[PDB]
Design a binder for this molecule. Structure first.
Ligand SMILES: CCCCCCCCO[C@@H]1O[C@H](CO)[C@@H](O)[C@H](O)[C@H]1O
Lengths: 122, 122
């Protein structure tokens, strides 16, 4: 579920996801279009390519099970599809954390019309 | 250019594009995610797949040359890349016109979070 993804981001990043990430760049949030704006926008590009692989379940609205065991997200459960989407979310939050230093405030709330017409390939 | 696409739509459809089409369904406008909402949302889906083929120029911001010769859009010019994008625009406007009867007002201003997680393939 996206609300779980939201907690993973808030925890690792310290920022309120709905404000700082929901509308960043060209690939964060919605779907995505063009070429990733920056390091953080690429984290979203990948997260998008990830959700594209999940077949058996709904990565957006399906609740998965994970644990913050040891300051790290621990994806669990007996369902591999859900565990799959959980690993997608876990990787993105980590990605956001590692690139926090190159986060530009000018890209949050970024206009899509300004995004490339040639989208990058997963 | 998108401003030319805008005139083609207004003419064929009678509707102000910025209001009735710029935010329709899941694919209309810059972007697109999930599965096309309806017949009109699919016109946008295709228009998007069209712009994906244009390689040598900017379908969004490049001005092309066309003419309303005989109540029909007539794409011209010596540039094939530009003529290509013009044909994309011309096809969509026509598409909007042919499906005007199934246009649902509930889809204009449609929220993206509500769009499918599994995008359709061009
Ligand atoms: C599909 C019909 C598009 C006709 C041209 C409309 C021009 C406005 O374009 C719109 O601008 C918005 C805000 O800048 C963006 O969020 C939309 O994605 C974009 O389509």
């Amino acid at each position: 579920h996206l609300l779980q993804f939201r907690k993973m981001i808030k925890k690792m990043t310290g920022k309120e996801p709905v404000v700082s990430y929901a509308f960043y760049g060209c690939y964060c949030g919605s779907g995505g279009r063009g070429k990733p704006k920056n390091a953080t926008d690429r984290c979203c590009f990948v997260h998008d390519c990830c959700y594209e692989k999940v077949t058996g379940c709904d990565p957006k609205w399906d609740d998965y099970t994970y644990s913050w065991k040891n300051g790290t997200i621990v994806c669990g459960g007996d369902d591999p599809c859900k565990k799959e989407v959980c690993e997608c979310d876990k990787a993105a939050a980590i990605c956001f954390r590692d690139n926090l230093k190159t986060y530009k405030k000018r890209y949050m709330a970024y206009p899509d019309i300004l995004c490339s017409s040639k989208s990058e390939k997963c």
